[PDB]
Amino acid sequence: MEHVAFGSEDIENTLAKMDDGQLDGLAFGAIQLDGDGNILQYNAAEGDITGRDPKQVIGKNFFKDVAPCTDSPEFYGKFKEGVASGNLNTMFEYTFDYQMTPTKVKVHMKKALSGDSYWVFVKRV
Ligand SMILES: *C(=O)/C=C\c1ccc(O)cc1
Numbered sequence: 001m002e003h004v005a006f007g008s009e010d011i012e013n014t015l016a017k018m019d020d021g022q023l024d025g026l027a028f029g030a031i032q033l034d035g036d037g038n039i040l041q042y043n044a045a046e047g048d049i050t051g052r053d054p055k056q057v058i059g060k061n062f063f064k065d066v067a068p069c070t071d072s073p074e075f076y077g078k079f080k081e082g083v084a085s086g087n088l089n090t091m092f093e094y095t096f097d098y099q100m101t102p103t104k105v106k107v108h109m110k111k112a113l114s115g116d117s118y119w120v121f122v123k124r125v
Contacts, residue, residue: 001025006123007091007108016113024054029105029122032112035083037063037076046122051100062120069098079109079118087111088118093125 002025004014015023015030020041023030029046033039039062042054052066063071063079070076075094082088091108108121 001027006106006121011121012110012113012119015119027123029120031062031120031122033062033079033118033120035116035118037061037079039066040117049103049105049122049124050096067096067098069096070094075107082109082111083118 002018002022004011004026006028008014020043023041024044026043026045029049030041030043031039031046032041039058039060042052042057044054046052047054050067057066060066063076074092078090078092079088082090088109088111091106094105094107096103096105104125105122106125108119110119110121111117112119
């Protein structure tokens with residue numbers, strides 16, 4: 001495993017060193033999106049939670065194609081405001097329910113260290 005704790009204050013510095021292989025070693029779901037919501041990275045733990053095959057979702061739009069239940073002011077809305085502002089750091093509970101058994105999760109979104117990428121971290125609650 002990669003020892004990083006969900007919600008950690010410096011998580012963005014830590015995850016900057018990890019490759020797709022490394023990211024698959026996290027205790028939680030990790031997704032990296034560009035400013036337009038396209039999926040740059042998607043780790044194994046997210047695949048375990050949502051049932052999606054990580055390889056198949058990279059390159060797709062998260063809010064439009066892959067995860068339309070997140071297309072709402074309460075999820076996508078916070079994302080777009082953070083991208084516009086160039087600053088994002090929010091944590092909230094949410095229910096994933098698209099093509100899958102409803103699953104309650106904790107979501108943490110944070111701007112990355114590179115200029116126009118953004119993390120979505122997810123774990124069960
Ligand atoms: C809402 O969109 C439900 C499902 C979902 C599937 C995959 C990922 O990564 C997040 C959310």
